[PDB]
């Protein structure tokens, strides 16, 4: 600054700390319902797809981890038919674990 | 005088009444992701007697 | 396919529609002191066409 200011390069960056980045599997990126339109669009359904993903990140100079969440339904139904009996049925879908 | 206020939405019917009913249903059905509310004037008029 | 989504409440009826109507009245009658609402899943589903 002032009459004697030195010629200068401009640097720009951003921070976004407590957030976790998201990409909705919905045809226009909006939350029209919890069960998205594309998740019903019976192409990405019964006749099953392979998925490849690639990320470019700043090199860190130490070993780090990509944390990737595949958002799915993770619902339980709990039935109590007789005194002291709990039958709980789980379904996580897609990415279901259990026969 | 009212013929000009009515045409220009200074007085008279609300947007939910002057728009064709087909468009009002369209707006009600899409309002959560495409919003049509900010594009139509709704008059408000003070009472003139009593 | 929907038989599983309906049984597991990922799509289909709301809790106000699949619960027996006696329980829906019990809940509405007690809701200010004993709250049953948070124990039943309500699906929400995006529109698939148009």
């Amino acid at each position: 600054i002032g009459q004697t200011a030195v010629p200068s390069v401009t640097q720009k960056k951003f921070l976004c700390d407590r957030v976790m980045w998201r990409i909705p599997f919905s045809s226009n990126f909006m939350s029209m319902g919890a069960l998205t339109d594309l998740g019903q669009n019976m192409l990405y359904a019964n006749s099953a797809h392979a998925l490849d993903m690639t990320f470019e990140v700043d090199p860190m100079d130490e070993p780090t981890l990509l944390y990737l969440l595949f958002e799915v339904f993770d619902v339980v139904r709990v039935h109590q038919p007789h005194r002291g009996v709990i039958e709980a049925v789980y379904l996580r879908t897609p990415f279901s674990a259990g026969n | 005088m009212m013929p000009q206020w009515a045409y220009m939405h200074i007085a008279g019917q609300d947007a939910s009444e002057y728009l064709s009913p087909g468009l009002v249903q369209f707006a009600r059905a899409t309002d959560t992701y495409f919003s049509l509310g900010n594009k139509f004037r709704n008059p408000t008029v003070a009472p003139t007697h009593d | 396919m929907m038989p599983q989504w309906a049984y597991m409440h990922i799509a289909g009826q709301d809790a106000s529609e699949y619960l027996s109507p006696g329980l829906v009245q019990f809940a509405r009658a007690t809701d200010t002191y004993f709250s049953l609402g948070n124990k039943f899943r309500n699906p929400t589903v995006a529109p698939t066409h148009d």
């Binding site: 319902g33 | 009600r28 059905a29 899409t30 309002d31 049509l36 | 995006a46 529109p47 066409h49």
Partner: peptide, 20 residues
């Protein structure tokens, strides 16, 4: 000092979150 439409409703996912 003024205001418009938008105070009108239809958000339920069953019964309809898009109907013609």
């Amino acid at each position: 000092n003024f205001a418009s439409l938008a105070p009108r409703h239809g958000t339920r996912p069953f019964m309809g979150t898009w109907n013609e």
